[PDB]
Amino acid sequence: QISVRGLAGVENVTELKKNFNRHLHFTLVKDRNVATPRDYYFALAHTVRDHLVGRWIRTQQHYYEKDPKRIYYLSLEFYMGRTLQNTMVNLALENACDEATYQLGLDMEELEEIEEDAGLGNGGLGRLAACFLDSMATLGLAAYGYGIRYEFGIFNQKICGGWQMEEADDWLRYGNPWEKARPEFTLPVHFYGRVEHTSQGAKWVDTQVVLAMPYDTPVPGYRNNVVNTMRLWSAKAPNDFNLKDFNVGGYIQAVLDRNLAENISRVLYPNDNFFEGKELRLKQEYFVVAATLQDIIRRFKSSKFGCRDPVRTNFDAFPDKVAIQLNDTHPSLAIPELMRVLVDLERLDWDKAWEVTVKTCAYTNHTVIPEALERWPVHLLETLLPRHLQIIYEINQRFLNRVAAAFPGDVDRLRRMSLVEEGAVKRINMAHLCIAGSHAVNGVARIHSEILKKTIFKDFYELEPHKFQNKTNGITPRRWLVLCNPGLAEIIAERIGEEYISDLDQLRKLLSYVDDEAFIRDVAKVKQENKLKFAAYLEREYKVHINPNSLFDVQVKRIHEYKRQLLNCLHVITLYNRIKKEPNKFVVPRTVMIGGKPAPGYHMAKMIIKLITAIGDVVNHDPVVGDRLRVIFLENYRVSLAEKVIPAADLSEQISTAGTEASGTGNMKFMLNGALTIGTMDGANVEMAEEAGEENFFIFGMRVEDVDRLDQRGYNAQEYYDRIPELRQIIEQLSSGFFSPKQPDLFKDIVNMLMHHDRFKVFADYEEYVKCQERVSALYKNPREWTRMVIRNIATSGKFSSDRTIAQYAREIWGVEPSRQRLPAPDEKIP
Amino acid sequence: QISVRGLAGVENVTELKKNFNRHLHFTLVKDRNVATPRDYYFALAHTVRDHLVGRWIRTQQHYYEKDPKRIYYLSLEFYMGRTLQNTMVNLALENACDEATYQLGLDMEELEEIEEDAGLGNGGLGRLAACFLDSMATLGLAAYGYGIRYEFGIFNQKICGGWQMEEADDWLRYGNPWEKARPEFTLPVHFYGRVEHTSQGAKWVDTQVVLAMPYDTPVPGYRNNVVNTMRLWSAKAPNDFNLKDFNVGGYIQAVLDRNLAENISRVLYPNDNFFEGKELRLKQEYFVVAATLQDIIRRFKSSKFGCRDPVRTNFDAFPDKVAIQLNDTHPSLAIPELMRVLVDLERLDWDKAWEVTVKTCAYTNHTVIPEALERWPVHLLETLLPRHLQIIYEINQRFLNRVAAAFPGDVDRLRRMSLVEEGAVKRINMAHLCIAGSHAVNGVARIHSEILKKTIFKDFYELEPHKFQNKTNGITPRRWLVLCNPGLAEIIAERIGEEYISDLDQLRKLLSYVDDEAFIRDVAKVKQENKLKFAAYLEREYKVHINPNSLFDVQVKRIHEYKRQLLNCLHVITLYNRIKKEPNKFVVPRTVMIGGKPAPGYHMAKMIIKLITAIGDVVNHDPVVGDRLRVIFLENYRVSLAEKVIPAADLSEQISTAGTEASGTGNMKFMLNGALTIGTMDGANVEMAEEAGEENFFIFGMRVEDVDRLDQRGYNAQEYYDRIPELRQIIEQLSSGFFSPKQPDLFKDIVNMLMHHDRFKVFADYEEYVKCQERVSALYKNPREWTRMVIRNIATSGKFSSDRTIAQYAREIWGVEPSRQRLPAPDEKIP
Ligand SMILES: *Cc1c(COP(=O)(O)O)cnc(C)c1O
Ligand SMILES: *Cc1c(COP(=O)(O)O)cnc(C)c1O
Ligand SMILES: OC[C@@H]1[C@@H](O)[C@H](O)[C@@H](O)c2nnnn21
Ligand SMILES: OC[C@@H]1[C@@H](O)[C@H](O)[C@@H](O)c2nnnn21
């Protein structure tokens, strides 16, 4: 066998080679003698896409005949990655396409590397939305993902001289085989304008019009013939006023200025956990909300209502036919917008319209760090969206009256709960708009949802306890096991079968093989094969050598002070310093690989990439160190690079200050792929250690209590400097130019910060972190017992499947039951 | 029979219905129950496009194995119109697709109306280039059309309140089924920068880079299996410097500013016979030249040279493998650019490089009116293209030295011939660069090429007589007979066969039926059927009724003072005035239809559209006139509207002041479609009257001699005003608000101009024009004898085929022999 990537059947390997040669000639208009690997990749992309249009068309007509409650997942980010392999996995096409291209004389693997990632996300948030869409289609949900088809996704990172250089991601330069533009369904979105209060309504008048044109991408569930839809809006100028708001300027200039309306979907904002209050961002937020709500209401007005049902467009059943989920506060304008359409256009009374709005909306909060929070200045909302500010003031008015009635006399509560923040500039607090206008609010890991109830939304929890929930994040076992680690999925499937791919709790059955000797050597063999293949990819695409027999220590995630790549840096420098001190003493060899992108304006995260490259500069060229220690910055980290490094890791760094990483999902990916975790009791590390047992994890540090104790006291970093010689030695190395010789003051900003303004108190966890790291090296030395802990982690990772998450969203927030029932075939059909 | 639009064969009607249902499902991802006519149009467009990719691939590999001399036709305009029907005509698919969609229950005609015109031209020039491409593919020439893929072609004209309103032509909103993007073949184009003169060369340094990405459209010859290529460049920003010319500005802003480089192909300049010296226009001109020349040289470096031939890249054979034709001076920078690449990059000596450049280039001049002429200010060329200005100064230097040697002492000649014009601003005269750097210069009709030799390029003709040629324009019989007038092509084909479609001189054989009674009634019957169908289309898409039993008097062309829609206006007002004077006197009924677009800044042409609508306002609502006279402005005139009005015309207006319309091609279209011509002895009207006999035409007016006599004297329009009461009456009607009641001064600008600054002396031809118009009404009254003159014109129109024009370009300028040999089948094949 190759692996169990499906059957390579006789009629179907021949079917696929026929269609591959059809598309190269008819679609690509190339012949075999001028086709490059890229043309061969497109011939394949088109042949696999033909296998899901049958199922797409019949999944959509099915939701039309039966009319289930529809789930609208609204996100400004969807981080899909590449879609050829994933689509072959979900349709069971992967071995038939492997044989078929083999017979055509091509390497499928070589062609899969040609696909550009769809990079429409920054990281965690965007990828949670792509893992969610996979699980909704796998669980038979009538679900729709909605977002912006950005033409430039997250920048490609280049390192020049150790510094990040950002360059535009032109992911569409060659085309996207997977979208279907739907210009028939373009919709108008209004901006600026003013409100006339006339007789039987307010009206929004003298608005600028932008057209939202849809592009649909298919989302296939795993082996069940459901193919749901991701619809992504693109901005288009009208050809009228963007031209005929006549009377000199210039004709050519009017046409060139069209790219003013079309700039709304041009580029993703490259910030992860940081709010920039730019007008273009708010235009992006209103545009995906306005266009999506029109499409939603349009579908509901057909339903079985636009036939009969009671007969009246009674929006009373709108919540029993519509669930819209808000992915963070970025689509929060869906609350005042659903109100506007219903009061202003459909003419419902306010209070009916408000009951229908809270009953269909639900809000997911993703972080508690204050600079991530949206607080949009009122003059901005006032200019651009004047009806919506009025609706926000009226919602506020009425909500604070409920607070006043329940907490009579508590005047500080009222100022603390207001959706309107007074101050220098007044602002609207979008998270407050979202708790007031949603029937459910949830965090993303059990400790983060407890921190919401206890600290940041405590007033809101005391008011309406029944709204706050938890739904711990997950990861999809299809890309994150079966696709990136087929060998591990194989050796698992040999022992327990293939039903675990859509039932990840079945992995508990591996616990019976924790003492099976053939299993332990197999598990250790695929990890070694992954390490060898990544070690190779590295000299191929990017390198000057590494050693596959070392511990692969990796921390790959966005560069932030709260995720503390700096604490990892302090640990690498220690290791170096100890082996400069005792050169001929044995130490377990490590390749520590750190990678991630910094948002362009985040000066400290840019300085941290520069420190990591400066350490590898020194460490990787010291001869006394030899191959005992290598430090590597993993360039342009993205979804496809994660599918290559996470199978190859031995140790996962999940080192954020307790209370700052709300969940994390990279931690989950590493746990089902055979890495052991070194982490703090933060986010979902706590539920993972509870699932594997704390003995099967390396936890260290401060807990949330201890962080708050320290903050009661006052964190003084000099106390640590003064008491720990190894820590002291490192800072004066940074401070004197040991690591930056030509530019000795270069790192003074990291030193000054760590010493005087460290928000994430890197020094407080340093002692217990280098002690915990001594413990993992000790165990790496006992291969057999490292692999049995690995086994304890894999067999215990099934809780962290996004199928478990989506089934709890479905039941406890959406009111819909998941299915795992194969939809009636693909079978051809024309009606 | 339906007509002879090919066979509707059994295996092939079934082949086409299979493929139509394949594309609607697999390409369009629609099913029969949600498909609109537009989806049905795309299913068809894709099924007919599959039939020419076989022939395209094998026509191109054929020119590769046999390696003929290649003809590069460089134009900034290609006015293609719609391409579904035209492609069905050239592949003999039209009746099989008619039966196939009929069986599917659809009307092909209804779907053909859904296609948007490719409007990448202003009129005459752009359409001559589309008629040329058809004839080169029909004559087996290895020819390539090269231009800019503008994303906005010529604006769509809207009339509000009688005024033209321009709106952006978003022809690509729904997609173009016919192009194939070729992003693999993107090429760099450089701008700005500076020149370093270093040791063994000048170098062009610190340039801004724009990428030219190609899009190929197929050009099928008529029924010969040749499918040539039209390649159209699109501008794309690099993702490097258009981003990493680093150091603050803003990351988002850098990505948004990409549409600064991409504005180069955004919109066609909407000016016909008028030069605007805007920097964006010159960027458009360099960009199609730079990118095209790279592709040209790239193809030549493979040829049989990049194998062996002598062995050295001896550019000596470049003229024997390459012909590049300059369509007007818009690609004139192809001369200094071919020099730059050869001296600066390929390191040929100047004089070898100059001999190779003049021997491969040829220039077509299209007009003598002075404001149409390109004279680019030197500070513009100096900034943007500094190497090329140096090369232009060196070419000038050397050319004037040849003039000095031949005309010793003639110092005025030298200042008159210079490519550099001194004055207020120095300018480069692009037409002079083109005669100096081309081995052939030609005009477009016999009198226009005589006017070039006698007036505008007289000095150049005395210097190098052997360069000046004539190549009278033509029209393609495939769109302009067979496609727009199938009934006329039928009744012709009944009598003489179908070989005339690629041999239009065979139409002379209709002269034997000028007295055949069945033929005369047939010819009269298709004209009546065309008139009925256009009269219908009109109430459908646009109307409030016309009478098909009147003479259809039409003048449809761009609005210009030289084409004199104003003289036609004077004639309509006369007719009205005479029948207000004698109400109960019979006059032959006329529907006079005038249509065309005005360039946006051309205030007088905009005022002329407004006069025409103001006349129809009055005339079409006078009850005394009844249906004896209707005046209609034919909105948004373009290629597809021409295919509908020109079959339906009885009389063609070709009324420009002698010496101003260099050729005209609308005049030709009307002559093979059964309209009689009222015209002056201008452009190609002279060769048409010479071909049908002046008895078979209505010529009037001043000849060129008489225009110059009048200009020797001094044209005084008041002399006409004073002597012709009917003319006098009209001007005081204009002047008093008879035609503009609420705004009595509205037309004072037309009056003031006609009276004091008429360049095209509208009043001098007025008497002989209304007398000639009395003669055509007299003959319309004798139906039998109108149709025998019509017959004398049709049978005599074969000279005016673009197949005759291209065969004289081929033989007398390009050095290649036309073929009419069917290329070896389409037959499948994979190598
Ligand atoms: C999963 C993923 C993330 C999230 O990882 P965390 O460690 O939770 O921050 C970010 N980026 C990429 C490319 C990922 O695949
Ligand atoms: C052929 C054509 C022209 C040229 O007509 P002239 O009468 O020579 O000016 C212009 N516009 C359209 C749409 C045409 O088809
Ligand atoms: O919920 C998905 C991820 C969480 O796992 C991260 O911990 C948190 O920082 C975040 N912010 N936005 N999206 N996310
Ligand atoms: O050659 C094609 C046509 C001629 O027929 C016109 O008479 C002339 O005004 C023109 N200018 N540019 N292109 N053209």
Pairwise CA distance, residues A80 & A134, whole Å: 10
Question: CB of A610 within 8 A of CB of A590?
Answer: no
Pairwise CA distance, residues B146 & B819, whole Å: 22
Pairwise CA distance, residues B80 & B143, whole Å: 16
Q: Tokens at residue B795, please?
A: 């049978």
Contact residues, A window 273-292, toward B, CB-based 8 Å cutoff: 278, 280
Residue A752 lies in a domain: yes
What 8-state DSSP symbol labels residue B107? -
**Nearest of A794, A669, A822 to residue A131 by alpha carbon:** A669
Residue B590 Cβ inside 6 Å of ligand 4? The answer reads: no
Pairwise CA distance, residues B459 & A85, whole Å: 70
Please indicate, yes or no, whether residues A520 and A577 belong to a single structural domain of this protein: yes
The alpha-carbon radius of gyration of chain A (Å, integer) is 28
Residue B664 Cβ inside 6 Å of ligand 4? The answer reads: yes
User: In one letter, which amino acid is A708?
Assistant: D
Question: CB of B78 within 8 A of CB of B133?
Answer: yes
SS3 B610: helix
Q: Tokens at residue B785, please?
A: 């004898």
What 8-state DSSP symbol labels residue A500? G
Whether residue B242 lies within 8 A of chain A, CB to CB, comes out as: yes
SS3 B463: helix
Please indicate, yes or no, whether residues A435 and A542 belong to a single structural domain of this protein: no
**Nearest of A661, A642, A674 to residue A473 by alpha carbon:** A661
Please indicate, yes or no, whether residues A117 and A241 belong to a single structural domain of this protein: yes
A61–B31: do the CB atoms touch at under 8 Å?
A: yes
Give me ligand 2 centre to Cα B271, in Å.
14
Please indicate, yes or no, whether residues A447 and A572 belong to a single structural domain of this protein: no
Pairwise CA distance, residues A40 & A63, whole Å: 35
Number of C-beta neighbours around residue B15 at 10 A: 16
Residue A656 lies in a domain: yes
Pairwise CA distance, residues B531 & B293, whole Å: 47
What is the resolution in angstroms? 2.4
Residue A418 lies in a domain: yes
Q: Tokens at residue A103, please?
A: 């017979």
Cite the beta strand spans of B11-105 per DSSP E: 70-74, 78-81
* Residue A710 burial (10 A CB sphere; 0-12, 13-18, 19+): middle
Protein residue with least CA distance to atom 15, ligand 2: B639
Please indicate, yes or no, whether residues B483 and B452 belong to a single structural domain of this protein: no
Sign of the C-alpha dihedral computed for residues A300, A306, A308 and A310 taken in this order: positive
Question: CB of B49 within 8 A of CB of A25?
Answer: no
Give me ligand 2 centre to Cα B561, in Å.
16
Pairwise CA distance, residues B192 & B205, whole Å: 9
Residue B830 lies in a domain: no
Residue numbers after which chain A is interrupted (C to N above 2.5 A) read none
How many cross-chain Cβ pairs, A to B, lie less than 8 Å apart? 123
Please indicate, yes or no, whether residues A411 and A506 belong to a single structural domain of this protein: no
Confirm whether B563 is a catalytic residue: yes
Cα–Cα distances (Å) from B363 to A163, A271, A382, B281, B358, in that order, read 53, 55, 60, 20, 10
Spacing of C-alpha B182 from chain mean position: 26
Pairwise CA distance, residues A318 & A354, whole Å: 12
Task: Using alpha carbons only, give the angle B468, B472, B474 rounded to the nearest 5 degrees.
Answer: 150
Residue A506 lies in a domain: yes
In the block, tokens 């007719």 appear at: B575
Q: Tokens at residue A53, please?
A: 């249009």
Helix count and strand count (H, E) for chain A: 32, 23
Contact residues, A window 589-608, toward B, CB-based 8 Å cutoff: 600-601
Pairwise CA distance, residues B399 & B418, whole Å: 8
Number of residues in chain B: 831
Q: Tokens at residue A510, please?
A: 């591996």
H or E stretch covering B679 = strand B676-679
Spacing of C-alpha B509 from chain mean position: 30
Q: Tokens at residue B416, please?
A: 């008159």
| DSSP one-letter string for B335-378 | HHHHHHIIIIIS---HHHHHHHHHHHEEEE-----GGGS-EEEH
Pairwise CA distance, residues A242 & A253, whole Å: 10
H or E stretch covering B468 = strand B468-470
Please indicate, yes or no, whether residues B9 and B145 belong to a single structural domain of this protein: yes
Residue A370 lies in a domain: yes
Number of residues in chain A: 831
Please indicate, yes or no, whether residues B171 and B130 belong to a single structural domain of this protein: yes
Q: Tokens at residue A649, please?
A: 């890791």
In the block, tokens 């809270």 appear at: A358
Question: CB of B378 within 8 A of CB of B428?
Answer: yes
Q: Tokens at residue A661, please?
A: 């990483």
Cα–Cα distances (Å) from A536 to A243, A617, A646, A648, in that order, read 56, 21, 15, 11
Question: CB of A657 within 8 A of CB of A562?
Answer: yes
Q: Tokens at residue A353, please?
A: 């319209």
> Both ends of chain B: CA-CA distance in Å?
40
In the block, tokens 């109307």 appear at: B543
Residues 6+ apart with CB under 8 A from A503: A798, A803
Q: Tokens at residue B105, please?
A: 């229950």
Cα–Cα distances (Å) from B116 to A484, B106, B169, in that order, read 46, 19, 10
Residue B831 lies in a domain: no
CATH of the domain at B605: 3.40.50.2000
Residues 6+ apart with CB under 8 A from B274: B371, B372, B599, B602
Question: CB of B689 within 8 A of CB of B697?
Answer: yes
Cα–Cα distances (Å) from B270 to A237, A251, B119, B376, B558, in that order, read 20, 9, 11, 18, 11
Question: CB of B670 within 8 A of CB of B645?
Answer: no
Cite the beta strand spans of A178-293 per DSSP E: 180-181, 187-198, 201-220, 227-236
Q: Is A301 annotated as a binding residue?
A: yes
Give me ligand 2 centre to Cα A446, in Å.
73
Please indicate, yes or no, whether residues A790 and A808 belong to a single structural domain of this protein: no
**Nearest of B559, B656, B538, B535 to residue B610 by alpha carbon:** B559
Residue A813 Cβ inside 6 Å of ligand 3? The answer reads: no
Number of C-beta neighbours around residue A371 at 10 A: 10
User: In one letter, which amino acid is B469?
Assistant: Q
Helix/strand/coil (H/E/C) assignment for every residue in A642-706: HHHHHHHCCEEEECCCCCCCCCCCHHHHHHHCCCEEEECCCCCHHHHHHHHCHHHCEECCCCHHH
**Nearest of A432, A437, A364 to residue A809 by alpha carbon:** A364
Q: Tokens at residue A313, please?
A: 């467009």
**Nearest of B656, B686, B688 to residue B669 by alpha carbon:** B688
Pairwise CA distance, residues B452 & B448, whole Å: 6
Task: Using alpha carbons only, give the angle B60, B61, B62 rounded to the nearest 5 degrees.
Answer: 85
Q: Of A168, A252, A255, which has the smallest distance from its Cβ to B258's Cβ?
A: A168
Residue of A32, A164, A251, A274 to mutate for B, most B C-beta atoms under 10 A: A251
Question: CB of A380 within 8 A of CB of A460?
Answer: no
Residues 6+ apart with CB under 8 A from A639: A79, A80, A81, A82, A117, A119, A127
**Nearest of A516, A523, A293 to residue A388 by alpha carbon:** A293
Number of C-beta neighbours around residue A420 at 10 A: 17
H or E stretch covering B138 = helix B124-138
Residue A367 Cβ inside 6 Å of ligand 3? The answer reads: yes
Which residues are paired to A468 by β-bridges?
A441
Q: State the structure-solving technique.
A: X-ray
Question: CB of A157 within 8 A of CB of A165?
Answer: yes
Which residues are paired to A228 by β-bridges?
A219
Q: How many domains are there within chain B?
A: 2
Pairwise CA distance, residues A63 & A303, whole Å: 10
What 8-state DSSP symbol labels residue B169? -
Please indicate, yes or no, whether residues B795 and B806 belong to a single structural domain of this protein: no
Q: Tokens at residue B567, please?
A: 């003289």
The alpha-carbon radius of gyration of chain B (Å, integer) is 28
Nearest CA in chain A to B281: A252
Query: Could you give the maximum distance between any two Cα atoms of chain B, in Å?
Result: 89
Question: CB of A645 within 8 A of CB of A634?
Answer: yes
Of ligand 3's atoms, which has the minimum distance to the CA of residue A448?
7
Q: Per-residue b/e over A672-709, b at no fewer than 16 CB within 10 Å? A: bbbbbbbbbbbbbbbbbbebbeeebbbbbbbbbeebee
B256–A236: do the CB atoms touch at under 8 Å?
A: no
User: In one letter, which amino acid is A89?
Assistant: V
Which domain range does residue A780 map to?
Answer: 475-801
Residue B310 lies in a domain: yes
Give me ligand 2 centre to Cα B668, in Å.
10
Question: CB of A625 within 8 A of CB of A617?
Answer: no
Whether residue A56 lies within 8 A of chain B, CB to CB, comes out as: yes
Please indicate, yes or no, whether residues B770 and B809 belong to a single structural domain of this protein: no
Please indicate, yes or no, whether residues A581 and A538 belong to a single structural domain of this protein: yes
Question: CB of A213 within 8 A of CB of A82?
Answer: no
Residue A329 Cβ inside 6 Å of ligand 3? The answer reads: no
State the pairing for strand pair B118-120/B78-81: antiparallel
Number of C-beta neighbours around residue A766 at 10 A: 20
Question: CB of B749 within 8 A of CB of B734?
Answer: no
**Nearest of A358, A366, A369, A370 to residue A467 by alpha carbon:** A358
Provide the shortest C-alpha distance from residue A200 to chain B (in Å). Answer: 33
H or E stretch covering A611 = helix A603-619
Q: Per-residue b/e over A301-333, b at no fewer than 16 CB within 10 Å? A: eebebeeeeeeebebebbbebbbbbbbbbbbbb
User: In one letter, which amino acid is A418?
Assistant: S
